[PDB]
Design a protein around this ligand. Structure first.
Ligand code: HEM
Ligand code: HEM
Ligand SMILES: COC(=O)N1CCN(c2ccnc(-n3ccnc3)n2)[C@@H](CC(=O)NCc2ccc3c(c2)OCO3)C1
Ligand SMILES: COC(=O)N1CCN(c2ccnc(-n3ccnc3)n2)[C@@H](CC(=O)NCc2ccc3c(c2)OCO3)C1
Ligand SMILES: O=S([O-])[O-]
Ligand SMILES: O=S([O-])[O-]
Lengths: 295, 295
């Protein structure tokens, strides 16, 4: 075998124009090829502008349209994603102009709100600024936008035990329940991560005595979007969930799950929208294992 | 004399609870003893939970913290290791949940990347699932993560002549250069080994006409970690290298070697982290000499 790595690590310097160019060209190719025999003059022109730009600025900016196309194509290329069948149903939030962790927070707040949509889950992705030299990376240290802390008898999510310790170390006041929603650990422009509490009303939970519940919104926070040689280390996305007591409560409280109805319904919308792998979503090495602290 | 064996062979059945228990207890002892006079109540509790667990499941799971402690203590106990002076500088990757060779491959890919770190070598260990009955062993058939094949006039590394033949027998397409990087021969859950080509960009080489070069990352792939009666047959680790043309090129290309600066620097970090032997790393009998082929 010769499988490729699903992880795309850090860089301490920009991509060689000699590496970036062939990649940029192939993306513009597949992007414009999507207009089958249409816009050949548009294609050629884009090729020149992009090339000139990489040659002068050392990099290039995708159009919003190329971005939206990349996010959807990268979703289609997600091997294990079951929801990719309806890849056209995706809302893209352009935060490529984001510059601070406070701004990141606000963008993430906007995504959670739109996406949650009172239980009627909508798929969305918020794309932050692309990696430049690798020394000014935007990153969400969390693995998911919404997740429960695991403390001590483990009091919480045993799966988040490491990250929870990290938050406490960053200053986060650890309560000790088993359903504590972890704050967002946001890194902007390569700085040290800032901790921000997620407004509690933004978090929709399905109430499964046991006193059990769970969050409604499944959002991956730590992947990297690669497109045309460009890399976006911060691009949180979400879908809706795919043991029967749960299946019943999600439905009872009207929070979207991938049941037969939703399967039929979303595919229908997807279909009614009809009228190495790249782009691709890569895993990353956990940021606390690679971060060089300023403070 | 009465030296002990440095090899820890295979088992075809689980460890007797009567053998495992005294061992588990002594590890929890030294682990908790590390908090000198602190957490005696924590210690006692752990003892009960572990005992109960061995008695019910027939075995026990270390905490991530106990694992990290074991990996570092086993490094400290490595007699011939010169880098153990700075044993606190170790990154642990928990793959105890790994279940397939494809997953193993991905984990190994993640380690190589982190560890290599563009030449600025970082020490890491990736720990795979512990031996259960001995019939579902995870193993890396390679002796090192990165090594050159030796063919024929020997065309390569004479030291890897046997393993190279093995790879070819497993299906590997042998090129015939003297710097062919061998694929990874991964055994998951006791099955037959699967061959995976290491993504070439993951391999950093120091370019020593002669056309000589060498890989930057020295990683031991075939040792066994014993801790508290538990055994981990798959736990690849690495450090950085410790004839003058070489010393100069490693430095010139900024690939970490254990020179006076690195010696001062790493010890400093190690020190600034201050603010029979068990655990222990055992050698193993070469897996092709003991493997029972399914296919
Ligand atoms: C709309 C509902 C969706 C459903 C029901 C769905 C379902 C799934 C499932 C079942 C998994 C595997 C879970 C696991 O490994 O435990 C998954 C993984 C994943 N999904 Fe989705 N998903 C949805 C939306 C999205 C969106 C909007 C994107 C991106 C824009 C996306 C990208 C991916 C990625 C990148 C992974 C990992 C793929 C891999 O590693 O092979 N998903 N999804
Ligand atoms: C950080 C840099 C490190 C340096 C420079 C270093 C240096 C060495 C040297 C010089 C040897 C002997 C080589 C030989 O026999 O030819 C060695 C062996 C060994 N090292 Fe390291 N090492 C490092 C990191 C590590 C790490 C991270 C671990 C494990 C977590 C480790 C575990 C061992 C083991 C188990 C052996 C064999 C010991 C024995 O059989 O007595 N080393 N190392
Ligand atoms: C090695 O790790 C991984 O490959 N992953 C990717 C899958 N995971 C998650 C977590 C939350 N949301 C999503 N997610 C959302 C849309 N697409 C995927 N994936 C994480 C694992 C996880 O918690 N999965 C539960 C799960 C199952 C089905 C889902 C889901 C989450 O979200 C949508 O459908 C980590
Ligand atoms: C009987 O065999 C053994 O005891 N061993 C253990 C030492 N060896 C190796 C090989 C690669 N990396 C390491 N290694 C890495 C970190 N610590 C040790 N050891 C192998 C032998 C070897 O190739 N040694 C070269 C060497 C020398 C100094 C090193 C080194 C490798 O790695 C770090 O410092 C096999
Ligand atoms: O948007 S599509 O290709 O059904
Ligand atoms: O981590 S220590 O004991 O210097």
């Amino acid at each position: 075998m010769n499988p490729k790595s699903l992880t795309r690590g850090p860089r301490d310097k920009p991509t060689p124009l000699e590496e970036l160019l062939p990649h940029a060209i192939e993306f513009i190719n597949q992007y414009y090829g999507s207009f089958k025999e249409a816009k050949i003059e548009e294609h050629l022109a884009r090729l020149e502008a992009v090339t000139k730009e990489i040659e002068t600025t050392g990099t290039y900016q995708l159009t919003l349209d190329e971005l939206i196309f990349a996010t959807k194509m990268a979703w289609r290329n997600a091997p294990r994603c079951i929801g990719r069948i309806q890849w056209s149903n995706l809302q893209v939030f352009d935060a490529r102009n984001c510059s601070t962790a406070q701004e990141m927070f606000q963008h993430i707040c906007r995504h959670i709100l739109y996406a949650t949509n009172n239980g009627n889950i909508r798929s969305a992705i918020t794309v932050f600024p692309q990696r430049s030299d690798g020394k000014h990376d935007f990153r969400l240290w969390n693995s998911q936008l919404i997740r429960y802390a695991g403390y001590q008898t483990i009091r919480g999510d045993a799966a988040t035990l490491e990250f929870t310790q990290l938050c406490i170390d960053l200053g986060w006041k650890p309560r000790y329940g088993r359903f504590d929603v972890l704050p967002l650990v946001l890194q902007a422009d390569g700085q040290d991560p800032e901790v921000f509490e997620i407004p509690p009303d933004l978090v929709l939970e399905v109430t499964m005595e046991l006193g059990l519940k769970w969050y409604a919104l499944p959002a991956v926070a730590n992947m990297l979007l690669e497109v045309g040689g460009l890399e976006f280390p911060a691009c949180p996305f979400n879908g809706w969930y795919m043991n029967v007591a749960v299946l019943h409560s999600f439905q009872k409280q009207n929070v979207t799950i991938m049941d037969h109805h939703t399967a039929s319904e979303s595919f229908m919308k997807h279909m009614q929208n009809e009228y190495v792998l790249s782009p691709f979503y890569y895993y990353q090495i956990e940021p606390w294992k690679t971060h060089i602290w300023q403070n």
